[PDB]
Amino acid sequence: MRHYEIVFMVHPDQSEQVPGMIERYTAAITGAEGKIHRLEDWGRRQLAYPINKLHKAHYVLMNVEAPQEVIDELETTFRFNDAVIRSMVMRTKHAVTEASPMVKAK
Amino acid sequence: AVVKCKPTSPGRRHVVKVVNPELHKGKPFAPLLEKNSKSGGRNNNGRITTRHIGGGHKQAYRIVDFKRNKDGIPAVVERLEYDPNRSANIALVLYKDGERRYILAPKGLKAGDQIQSGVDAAIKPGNTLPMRNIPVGSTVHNVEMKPGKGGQLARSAGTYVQIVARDGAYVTLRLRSGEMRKVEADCRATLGEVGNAEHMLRVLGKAGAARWRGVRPTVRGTAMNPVDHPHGGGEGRNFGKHPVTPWGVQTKGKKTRSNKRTDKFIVRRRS
Amino acid sequence: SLSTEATAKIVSEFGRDANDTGSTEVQVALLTAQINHLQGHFAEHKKDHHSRRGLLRMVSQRRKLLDYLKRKDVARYTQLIERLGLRR
Amino acid sequence: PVIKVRENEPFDVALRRFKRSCEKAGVLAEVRRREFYEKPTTERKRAKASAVKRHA
Amino acid sequence: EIDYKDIATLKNYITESGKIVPSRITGTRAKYQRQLARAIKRARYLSLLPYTDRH
RNA sequence: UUAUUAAAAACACAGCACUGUGCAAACACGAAAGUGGACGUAUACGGUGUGACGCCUGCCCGGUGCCGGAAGGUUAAUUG
RNA sequence: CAAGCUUGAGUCUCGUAGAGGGGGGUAGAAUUCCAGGUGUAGCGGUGAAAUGCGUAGAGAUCUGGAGGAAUACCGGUGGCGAAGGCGGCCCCCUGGACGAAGACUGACGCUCAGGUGCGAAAGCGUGGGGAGCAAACAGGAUUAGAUACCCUGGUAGUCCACGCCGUAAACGAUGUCGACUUGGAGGUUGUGCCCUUGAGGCGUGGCUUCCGGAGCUAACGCGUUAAGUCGACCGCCUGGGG
Ligand SMILES: [Mg+2]
Ligand SMILES: [Mg+2]
Ligand SMILES: [Mg+2]
Ligand SMILES: [Mg+2]
Ligand SMILES: [Mg+2]
Ligand SMILES: [Mg+2]
Ligand SMILES: [Mg+2]
Ligand SMILES: [Mg+2]
Ligand SMILES: [Mg+2]
Ligand SMILES: [Mg+2]
Ligand SMILES: [Mg+2]
Ligand SMILES: [Mg+2]
Ligand SMILES: [Mg+2]
Ligand SMILES: [Mg+2]
Ligand SMILES: [Mg+2]
Ligand SMILES: [Mg+2]
Ligand SMILES: [Mg+2]
Ligand SMILES: [Mg+2]
Ligand SMILES: [Mg+2]
Ligand SMILES: [Mg+2]
Ligand SMILES: [Mg+2]
Ligand SMILES: [Mg+2]
Ligand SMILES: [Mg+2]
Ligand SMILES: [Mg+2]
Ligand SMILES: [Mg+2]
Ligand SMILES: [Mg+2]
Ligand SMILES: [Mg+2]
Ligand SMILES: [Mg+2]
Numbered sequence: 093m094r095h096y097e098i099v100f101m102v103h104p105d106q107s108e109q110v111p112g113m114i115e116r117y118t119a120a121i122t123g124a125e126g127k128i129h130r131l132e133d134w135g136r137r138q139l140a141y142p143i144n145k146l147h148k149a150h151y152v153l154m155n156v157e158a159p160q161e162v163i164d165e166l167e168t169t170f171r172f173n174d175a176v177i178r179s180m181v182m183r184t185k186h187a188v189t190e191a192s193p194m195v196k197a198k
Numbered sequence: 199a200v201v202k203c204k205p206t207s208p209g210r211r212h213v214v215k216v217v218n219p220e221l222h223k224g225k226p227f228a229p230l231l232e233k234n235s236k237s238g239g240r241n242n243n244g245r246i247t248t249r250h251i252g253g254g255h256k257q258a259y260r261i262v263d264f265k266r267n268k269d270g271i272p273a274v275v276e277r278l279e280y281d282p283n284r285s286a287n288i289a290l291v292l293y294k295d296g297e298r299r300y301i302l303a304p305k306g307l308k309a310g311d312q313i314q315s316g317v318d319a320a321i322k323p324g325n326t327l328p329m330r331n332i333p334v335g336s337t338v339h340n341v342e343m344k345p346g347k348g349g350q351l352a353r354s355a356g357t358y359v360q361i362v363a364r365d366g367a368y369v370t371l372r373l374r375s376g377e378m379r380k381v382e383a384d385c386r387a388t389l390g391e392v393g394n395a396e397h398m399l400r401v402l403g404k405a406g407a408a409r410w411r412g413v414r415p416t417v418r419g420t421a422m423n424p425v426d427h428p429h430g431g432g433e434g435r436n437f438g439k440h441p442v443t444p445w446g447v448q449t450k451g452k453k454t455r456s457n458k459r460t461d462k463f464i465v466r467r468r469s
Numbered sequence: 470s471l472s473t474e475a476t477a478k479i480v481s482e483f484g485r486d487a488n489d490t491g492s493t494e495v496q497v498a499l500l501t502a503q504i505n506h507l508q509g510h511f512a513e514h515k516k517d518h519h520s521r522r523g524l525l526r527m528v529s530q531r532r533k534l535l536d537y538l539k540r541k542d543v544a545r546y547t548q549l550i551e552r553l554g555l556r557r
Numbered sequence: 558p559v560i561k562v563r564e565n566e567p568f569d570v571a572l573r574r575f576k577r578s579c580e581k582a583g584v585l586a587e588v589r590r591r592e593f594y595e596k597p598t599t600e601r602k603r604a605k606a607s608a609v610k611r612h613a
Numbered sequence: 614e615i616d617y618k619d620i621a622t623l624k625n626y627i628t629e630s631g632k633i634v635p636s637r638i639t640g641t642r643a644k645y646q647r648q649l650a651r652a653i654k655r656a657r658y659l660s661l662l663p664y665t666d667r668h
Numbered sequence: 669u670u671a672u673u674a675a676a677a678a679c680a681c682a683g684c685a686c687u688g689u690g691c692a693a694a695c696a697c698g699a700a701a702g703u704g705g706a707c708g709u710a711u712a713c714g715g716u717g718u719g720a721c722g723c724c725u726g727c728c729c730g731g732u733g734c735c736g737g738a739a740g741g742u743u744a745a746u747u748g
Numbered sequence: 749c750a751a752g753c754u755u756g757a758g759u760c761u762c763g764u765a766g767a768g769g770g771g772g773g774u775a776g777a778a779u780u781c782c783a784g785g786u787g788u789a790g791c792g793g794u795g796a797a798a799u800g801c802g803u804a805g806a807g808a809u810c811u812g813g814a815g816g817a818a819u820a821c822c823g824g825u826g827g828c829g830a831a832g833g834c835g836g837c838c839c840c841c842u843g844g845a846c847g848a849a850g851a852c853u854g855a856c857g858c859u860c861a862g863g864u865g866c867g868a869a870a871g872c873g874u875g876g877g878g879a880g881c882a883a884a885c886a887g888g889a890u891u892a893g894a895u896a897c898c899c900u901g902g903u904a905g906u907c908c909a910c911g912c913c914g915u916a917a918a919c920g921a922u923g924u925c926g927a928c929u930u931g932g933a934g935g936u937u938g939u940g941c942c943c944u945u946g947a948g949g950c951g952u953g954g955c956u957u958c959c960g961g962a963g964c965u966a967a968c969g970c971g972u973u974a975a976g977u978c979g980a981c982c983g984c985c986u987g988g989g990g
Contacts, residue, residue, distance in 0.1 A: 099659060101659070139660045140657075140660045140661060140662055140663040140668075141660055141663055141664070141668040141776080142668070143660065143775095149660075153618075160839095160840075163839090164839090164840090167773085167839090171333075171773090172321050172333060178659065178660075178774095178775090180655075180658065180659060180774095180837090180838070181838070181839070182655075182838070182839085183838090183839075192618055193616070193618055193619050193620075193621075194618060197621075208720090209682090211720080211721085212682065212683075212720065212721080213682090232707090234707080237704065237705090237706090238704095239696095239704065239705080240697095240703095240704065241696085241697060241698085241702090241703040241704040241705095242697090242698095242702075242703045242704080243697050243698065243703070243704090244697090245696085245697050245698090245703095245704085246696085246697085246704090247695085247696045247697050247703075247704045247705075248695080248696070248704060248705050248713090248714075249696090249714090250714095251704090251705085259707070261707095283706095283707085283708075284708070284709095284712095285708095285711060285712075286711090343690085343691080349709095350690090350691065350709060351690075351691090351709065351710095352709080352710090353708080353709050353710095353712085354708090354709070354710070354711050354712055355711050356711050357709085357710070357711065357712090362814085363813085373690065373710080374690095374709095374710055374711090374712095375689085375690070375710050376710095377690060377710095379690065392711090394711085395711075396711090396875095397711055398711040398875085399711090399874085399875085401682075401683075402682055402683090403682060403683095403720095404681080404682060405680070405681040405682060406681095406682095407682075408681080408682070415679090415680050415681075416680080416681095417679075417680080418679090418680095418716080418717070418718090419715090419716075419717095420716090420717080421678085421679065421680095429716085429717095437717090440732080440733050440734085441687090441715085441716050441717075441733095442715090442716085443695080443714090443715055443716080444696095444715080445695085445696080447695090447715090448733075448734070449687065449688075449714095449715045449716055450686065450687050450688090450715080450716055450717085450733095450734080451686085451687060451688085451733085451734045451735065452687085452688075452733095452734065452735085453688070453689095453734095453735080454688060454689070454694055454695080455688085455689070455690095455693090455694075457690095457692085457693085459692090460690080460691090460692090463690090464690075466782090468689095468690090468710095470842085470843080473761085476760075476761095477760085477761095480759090480760070480852095484852085485852090486852095488760095488851060488852060489851095489852055489853080490759050490760040490761090490851075490852050490853085491758075491759045491760075491851085491852035491853040491854085492759085492852070492853050492854095493853065493854095493856075495759070495760085495852085495853085496758070496759055496853080499759070499760085507842080507843095509841095510770090510841060510842060511842095513770085513771080513841080514769085514770045514771070514841075514842075515770090516769090516770065516771095517769055517770040517771090517841090517842070517843085518769070518770090518865090518866065518867095519768060519769035519770080519829075519842090519843060519844090519866095520768095520769055520770070520841090520842050520843045520844095521769095521843085521865090521866095522769095522830080522843070522844090522865090522866080523769095523842085523843035523844060524842095524843080525865085526843090526844090530758080533856070534758085534856070536856090537855095537856040538856085540856090541856085558629070558630060558666075559666060582628070582629075582630050583821090587820075587821095591820090594881080604824090604825095605825070608824080608825050609825075609958095611825095612958090627821090628821085630821090631821080632820085632821040632822080633821050633822040634821085634822085635821085635822065635823075635824090636822085636824095637824090643824085643826075643935085643936070643937095644765085644936090644937085646822075646823095647765095647766095647822085647826095647827095649822080650821090650822040650823090651822090651837085653821095653822080654822085654836065654837060655837070655838090657775085657776075657836095657837090658774085658775060658776085658836095658837060658838085660775095663776095664775090664776050664777070664820095664821095665776080665777065667777090668776090668777095
């Protein structure tokens with residue numbers, strides 16, 4: 093029942109499924125009695141180096157309080173999904189809700 | 199678990215057996231049994247066509263599903279059983295409608311596990327899906343060559359197949375021999391490896407253990423007369439010739455594949 | 470190692486009050502809960518030699534405390550090793 | 558150390574820019590160190606000696 | 614305290630070739646130089662910063 | 669194991685190795701249809717050599733074989 | 749022997765830093781190989797060469813793919829660990845250390861023959877893997893010779909899992925534990941207070957580096973992290989060879 097910061101970037105050719113992709117993963121998280129601290133759609137962003145002959149991935153950030161058996165199944169759906177090109181789960185000490193620098197860079 | 203025997207007799211000194219305690223100690227499922235009588239390596243002309251085959255223990259045949267086409271319906275594994283017809287173990291599964299089938303037992307699968315076939319199944323060891331729905335890089339077994347025909351590759355104990363690439367209507371597989379092969383993407387595969395991976399760790403220990411499996415003794419061609427083998431003859435131990443088969447074809451190195459209609463599917467031969 | 474509420478249950482259960490954390494029976498029972506818990510770790514991680522050295526310090530500290538308790542008060546010592554299942 | 562030549566910049570000032578840029582970027586010394594293998598006991602002995610003779 | 618997502622702060626601590634500048638020169642204290650290098654390495658993985666120039 | 673002058677140090681053997689074989693398998697018996705291999709699928713199957721186990725297994729690719737390569741030289745039917 | 753005490757030794761509460769250990773994923777740069785494109789006579793190597801590679805199209809250059817190993821910069825007289833040792837990033841399991849204010853137990857302590865465990869690299873066994881490097885080996889040089897130093901290749905090994913071995917200039921060539929004995933300059937990691945702007949300063953713990961005083965030492969040197977002044981216990985030495 094720990095805090096996690098999750099970043100995943102999406103292939104840009106399926107960027108209109110992104111609000112559908114977010115609200116599908118939320119029902120698995122709030123449905124595990126885990127609370128959601130932040131949820132930021134960053135949009136299309138120029139990559140610093142090419143991945144899979146690409147640039148301009150679609151970045152989504154969220155900060156989550158959840159148990160470990162929900163976050164373990166979130167990377168199985170990160171792995172077997174062909175739309176997520178890159179993801180990153182990190183453990184956090186305390187829940188974060190202040191706006192990130194990516195929201196205040198707009 | 200490999201176990202060493204104690205040298206209480208000279209025929210027991212070198213015996214190493216593989217003992218699996220999770221196998222079913224009991225009789226097999228009788229509706230899935232058939233008669234299977236032995237050949238002696240003789241064909242319908244009555245002639246020996248393969249040497250060194252004969253005797254051994256009586257065996258009944260288990261009908262194993264290599265097709266895995268009961269799509270959509272879940273199945274729970276009842277127990278693991280011994281199969282005398284192959285090196286791998288088999289599992290008895292129970293579908294929700296009440297059908298029982300034998301499958302090849304993959305690695306790590308116990309009683310109470312849930313398997314499912316079909317196009318919309320989950321990516322976990324034991325499930326069978328078409329290879330256009332399997333991630334590239336996966337380890338699969340019981341792989342089809344034609345769609346609907348049934349699994350033919352990676353059946354022996356501990357064997358598997360890696361899906362190396364998917365380009366178009368074909369996928370490229372790295373076979374267990376080291377061969378790269380194209381197979382069409384509508385063929386099914388089962389996730390995981392085949393179980394019983396320490397089958398190659400066993401030591402028979404004595405000549406009778408080979409005779410229990412229906413293996414007859416091999417005579418060296420150099421131990422014969424010239425009328426019997428190309429290697430025969432000599433006054434003492436003479437060889438003097440290039441090593442050949444009993445029918446005169448140079449063995450020890452010469453390639454024998456001559457099949458022009460399947461050569462387009464083979465990307466790289468083994469090394 | 471041991472968590473906070475699993476720790477505080479043993480102090481209320483095995484001590485004189487909720488302030489008595491330092492008595493001999495509490496220290497033996499706090500070591501016994503972690504020693505029995507770390508068996509599941511070392512059944513998976515046989516090659517973890519650097520953690521097993523810290524497990525063996527709890528084993529030698531419980532044995533020294535048990536031999537001290539037996540020399541002072543044997544009647545209290547018999548109650549503890551039955552409740553925890555030590556020495557058979 | 559990629560350096561573009563700007564407008565009406567002579568040649569010898571962009572040569573000097575390229576020379577100054579890869580001297581600061583540390584490219585020739587990274588290549589000349591990585592040309593032979595050094596044992597980790599020789600790396601520590603050189604590292605210890607360079608730290609002791611940094612005594613002003 | 615240092616964050617990998619703060620790209621404008623992290624870019625004042627890399628060279629034009631992308632190498633991390635040592636705190637001998639930048640003057641960062643030792644506790645924050647370790648937090649800077651770990652956070653720069655997280656950002657390189659998300660391709661917010663580059664490892665090199667050529668790529 | 670040489671029925672009927674040879675029972676052995678010969679044959680087999682568990683173990684070891686090399687080699688072929690991607691399944692309409694290699695291979696074998698069959699003018700062929702088919703069959704065995706196998707209701708097996710490379711942890712498998714055929715051929716060859718050595719012969720439990722222990723310590724081991726050095727140098728040579730000039731000759732013959734085999735695997736690979738294709739610039740070039742030479743080269744049949746066919747055309748004329 | 750009995751009864752105590754809290755100063756030694758332990759337990760709990762709140763935090764901090766860390767390449768401490770085990771397991772599973774993943775990323776980028778580079779080398780090698782395979783396929784294709786462009787292109788044409790050299791490449792490679794050395795003190796100079798040759799062996800080798802290359803007109804059957806090399807080396808160079810671009811695109812795509814496979815695979816293994818190691819993680820530039822950060823990076824340090826830096827940190828952790830009993831020692832051996834440990835360095836990309838992420839997750840799971842897990843050991844220790846240190847600080848603050850308290851509360852608790854009440855000498856529960858120190859050392860340790862025999863015993864048990866851990867223990868670099870090389871090596872051995874069984875099964876895998878095999879890019880780079882490289883004992884043995886081969887060829888080319890150098891040389892009086894050259895079983896070498898140099899060059900071109902190259903197998904075991906180096907890598908993984910599970911067992912074995914039990915040795916190193918395994919070194920601080922300095923056993924462990926405790927108390928006492930002037931100072932200076934630093935590093936690292938906590939914490940307290942003061943005008944909490946200036947923001948900076950003064951203390952108080954842990955670990956660590958370099959000088960140096962008394963004292964000690966054959967000298968060199970060591971010097972509050974002692975090789976100074978003492979106590980407890982253990983290991984070990986008795987001329988050089990053999
Ligand atoms: Mg045979
Ligand atoms: Mg044999
Ligand atoms: Mg004869
Ligand atoms: Mg003949
Ligand atoms: Mg003969
Ligand atoms: Mg003779
Ligand atoms: Mg002969
Ligand atoms: Mg911890
Ligand atoms: Mg006779
Ligand atoms: Mg007879
Ligand atoms: Mg007779
Ligand atoms: Mg007789
Ligand atoms: Mg006899
Ligand atoms: Mg044979
Ligand atoms: Mg023989
Ligand atoms: Mg030829
Ligand atoms: Mg670590
Ligand atoms: Mg080319
Ligand atoms: Mg090996
Ligand atoms: Mg050399
Ligand atoms: Mg080895
Ligand atoms: Mg010694
Ligand atoms: Mg050492
Ligand atoms: Mg040292
Ligand atoms: Mg010594
Ligand atoms: Mg000094
Ligand atoms: Mg002096
Ligand atoms: Mg003597």
